[PDB]
Design a protein around this nucleic acid. Sequence first.
DNA 1: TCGGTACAGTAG
DNA 2: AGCTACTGTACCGA
Lengths: 228, 229, 225
Amino acid sequence: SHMTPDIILQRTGIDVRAVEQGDDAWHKLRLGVITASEVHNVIAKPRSGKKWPDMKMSYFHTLLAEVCTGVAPEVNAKALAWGKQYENDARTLFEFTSGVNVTESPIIYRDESMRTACSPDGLCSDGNGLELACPFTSRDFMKFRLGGFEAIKSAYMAQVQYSMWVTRKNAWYFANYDPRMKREGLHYVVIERDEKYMASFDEIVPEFIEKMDEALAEIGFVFGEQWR
Amino acid sequence: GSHMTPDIILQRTGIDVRAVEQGDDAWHKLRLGVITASEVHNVIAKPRSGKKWPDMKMSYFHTLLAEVCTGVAPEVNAKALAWGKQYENDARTLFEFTSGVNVTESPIIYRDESMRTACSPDGLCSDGNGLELACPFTSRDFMKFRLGGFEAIKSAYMAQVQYSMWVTRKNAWYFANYDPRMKREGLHYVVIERDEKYMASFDEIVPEFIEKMDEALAEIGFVFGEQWR
Amino acid sequence: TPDIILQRTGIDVRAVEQGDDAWHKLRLGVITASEVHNVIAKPRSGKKWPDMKMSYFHTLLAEVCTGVAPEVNAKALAWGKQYENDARTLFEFTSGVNVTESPIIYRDESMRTACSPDGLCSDGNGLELACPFTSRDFMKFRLGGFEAIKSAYMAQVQYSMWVTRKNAWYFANYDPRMKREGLHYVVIERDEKYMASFDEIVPEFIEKMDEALAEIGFVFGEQWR
DNA sequence: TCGGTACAGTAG
DNA sequence: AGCTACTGTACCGA
Ligand SMILES: [Cl-]
Ligand SMILES: [Cl-]
Ligand SMILES: [Mg+2]
Ligand SMILES: [Mg+2]
């Protein structure tokens, strides 16, 4: 909103625009930041009471750990490698099927505070963003192919809605790709901006940030240390 | 009342069923999109509430449809299958000593000519019974069966055993576990009789499941059998 | 004493490089501190052993009858073993207490129950010194104290005091990734409600194990031959 | 309680 | 960011 490339450079020493999604600089820029693919944890509610669910508390401590250590752990598994492997082919096939042009984007922060950001799978020539998924199980691709909007995983929905909150955009493509499918290997939908989600982020996210600052202060740390 | 023949299998898959051995390439091919004994508990599963299909049933529903449309199936539980493969012969040789019946290895067996439903027994016995001979990856699981008997693990395996009897049209089935790590007495088994309650469940539930699969396949322009051609 | 253990296991405690074949052999069939939570687990209503408890029951019986144990946490143990020396050194500096490394400790001659402390302290306390695989877990404890992790570790700590007949126990976490202040610890006092729980539930669990072993023609001790 | 299913939680 | 896959608790109707 008042975010500028210079602010990023002065705080992190990193030139945004030169960041090629997945490189050392990209990992560095996400440290301690409430990000799209993880925000489902922030909006998670107890079924009774007000006590934070374990998944919310776990993400809370994960972000704080990133601030105080200045690092994030690396995990590897077949499903993760699969998604990484076919992302490029998914995007190309999406462009060919939909007829829209996709531009790759590095991280996008909501504002100058750098507390909140998303890393879109692409930005489209029609003003929509793009999220791709390449399910490791053909089962889960089939679930999306047959069910569509109502079949979308709640984590992906929170991720897509958060991306619209961050970028101030109004619509986001959600595409699934399976290279193993003989036919019908690509399926996508358009997810509209949901103001119920926007209201939820406007309420829960700033409170999550204040809670983090309180926690950092208790232990003698301050947000930003991960970048110095 | 099956009208299934080896020629039907050969024409639509290209595979000689008589040459099939459990775990081979042809074995895996012949199981694509097919409702199998080890997975049927998903098909006959009932909701926690309401009248809709339970989550686990919808998952298997999507799993089988995916096999039809991709022509492949992922290899899960590699460690346990390799363990079972390593001790297949020893288990069988010990089972034959203890029981006093001879075991003949079997290819995949389909219920009927539609090739929608099948089982793969660990052997067929000289007394007319089929055989399930597991080599549990964890000794804990062997011990559970050793001490609790049939009643302890009926939740996990009764459906599978009954389905094998539904497929083969047999009246009884051996359910056995072998654990080579046991210092002595590493074989335990029970005999399970054909249960007509389970047979009635398969007769009403399975065909409906098949019909809903064909509906979904048609919705995306696929037909059962594309996995084999 | 080591000579009694040597006579019954064929393993000399003074040796044991950890965690070798002999290290794992000593725990076979033994109710251990980090697994005791399974023994003390109750159903929400009634008296039937919950699945966790039955699972552990069968796991232990399998260890006696097979004389082997599967190995988990290859990644987590490799992390801990790398930093165990630096963890202890920093704990000694912070606490002002000196730590002696301790082999396995059995509660009694029956050798049915044991704990494996990360050290025995000069003030008389025991030590649990963990290097959590995630910095997330370090932070949970750093900010929440023992209230944040009592769910997971109170049983293990209390059981260790039950086994050793000690009155207090250090619970510490070390994280080398922390830019500063990478050691956090609390002192946990002996809880007599936990002691009473063990005095009741542990003996009956052992009795039920021996009953099952006798049913299948096995006896405790066979794993060490 | 029994005999199960749904899903939070979390490793990898 | 990447997507399961397994464990254990919550939950549900009889
Ligand atoms: Cl222990
Ligand atoms: Cl121990
Ligand atoms: Mg992405
Ligand atoms: Mg994606």
